[PDB]
Amino acid sequence: TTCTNCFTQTTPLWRRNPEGQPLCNACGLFLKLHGVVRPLSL
């Protein structure tokens, strides 16, 4: 698949967005813990 956020395809576990979108472990876990989407550089 592919994270809707960081677009990574490599991750130890796929999670989901309250809407149904697939997020990687980091992005999914981050949003759940802090409330906002995991920010990326650039």
Next chain:
Amino acid sequence: QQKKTIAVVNATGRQAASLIRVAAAVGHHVRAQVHSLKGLIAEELQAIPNVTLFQGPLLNNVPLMDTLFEGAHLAFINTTSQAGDEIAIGKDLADAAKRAGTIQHYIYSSMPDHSLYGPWPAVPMWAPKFTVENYVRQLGLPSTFVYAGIYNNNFTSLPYPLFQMELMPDGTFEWHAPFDPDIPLPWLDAEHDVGPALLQIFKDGPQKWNGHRIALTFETLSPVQVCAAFSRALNRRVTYVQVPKVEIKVNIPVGYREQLEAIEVVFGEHKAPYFPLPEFSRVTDEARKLWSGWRDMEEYAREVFPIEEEANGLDWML
């Protein structure tokens, strides 16, 4: 609970920038010192809303340190030798932090002094930090010390020192370092995991981490294993080659040379641990417990390496 104001220095640095992005994102106000305003990273940070920047050098500049901690409740401090004597700067920062009186948690990024664990020399950009750690402890600041592992992103095919994942003519990759090819070393994905982890530490508070030393590394791989990771991630053959010295293929500043030569002796000759401290001699346990969404070398290898290369100016990935 409440999002507090965080004081950071060396804002363009990888550890700090990682913390700043996630911190500003979740609602924390950031006050950070940057050497220069010009630059990609610099410009980016400037763009982030609740990020107030203070441009100026740290060395013998207490007025800047005072401003930085004004109204600051938290602080993540990681200095770079390039700015000058890290001991004098690290001590002035701690002084200002306490002098401010609102710091409830001062996270100082430290590094070992190898001469205190073996006949090994003191890695010049590492040892100084251990001294500042002692000075922080001495002032009574509610603190926590994090020891960063080797960055996944130091890697580049470009001719930069110590971590060049060079592109051979035959389309293969070769990495030349003094490190023993089989000795597992502590790695860390700075841009991906420093921020989340630091947030967790702040959220946990000094009530749990005060005075603690934490190894900021989420996985330990050997030079050969790191090579394995890159290989089964790029479809190409990557090999490690232990070389007695660091190949300086470009004009690097003096201070940075001294650093490498020391690295050659510690890791090349003596094969000493990265973290020679008894508490660190799994070391990755605490980090993973603080943040479960870390990025290993394989993901870095497959998802970031290609991307950073292209942007840097390379097309072997095309």
